[PDB]
Amino acid sequence: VIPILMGYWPLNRFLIRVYHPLLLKVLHWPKTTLLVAAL
Amino acid sequence: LRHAIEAVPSLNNPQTFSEQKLDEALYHGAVLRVRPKAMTVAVIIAGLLP
Amino acid sequence: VQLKPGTSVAFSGQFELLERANHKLKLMVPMTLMIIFVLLYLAFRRVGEA
Amino acid sequence: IIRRSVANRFLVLMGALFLSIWGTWTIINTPVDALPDLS
Structure with a gap:
């Protein structure tokens, strides 16, 4: 049903700004991320 | 993230020592995909806080 | 009329069932048309031909 | 499964309306209780 009535009918910038650097630093060292997750 | 990593970066890895675009692929998969996850978490917490 | 200590009055008859039966009918007559339409x-x- | 449903969408909308009416009726005519029978 959802597709039919879907075809008939600020905040995210902040999330992206806060996620960008953490995501980059995490992707730099994945092993340390997995280790701190285990901890 | 799988859609992201599948679309673009399926051509550069065969050439060894190539990881610059592999990170841009994950970035693309983590920039357009943030709003859905944030919305899911928000609605999940809000439908239970009351 | 006054009732003596230890006496009660009640009413019954065929009507008791009719009022119910008829009611139930008025619930299934519309639905039928619907499932027909x-x-x-x-x-x-x-919709014109129907 | 999704395309064949949006194709004939009028029937889907009619069924959804009938389901809404039926569910409303069942809701207004549902018994009530505090706790299920645990005895």
């Missing part, structure tokens, strides 16, 4: 449209894909 959805079929007629499916036969013509148009």
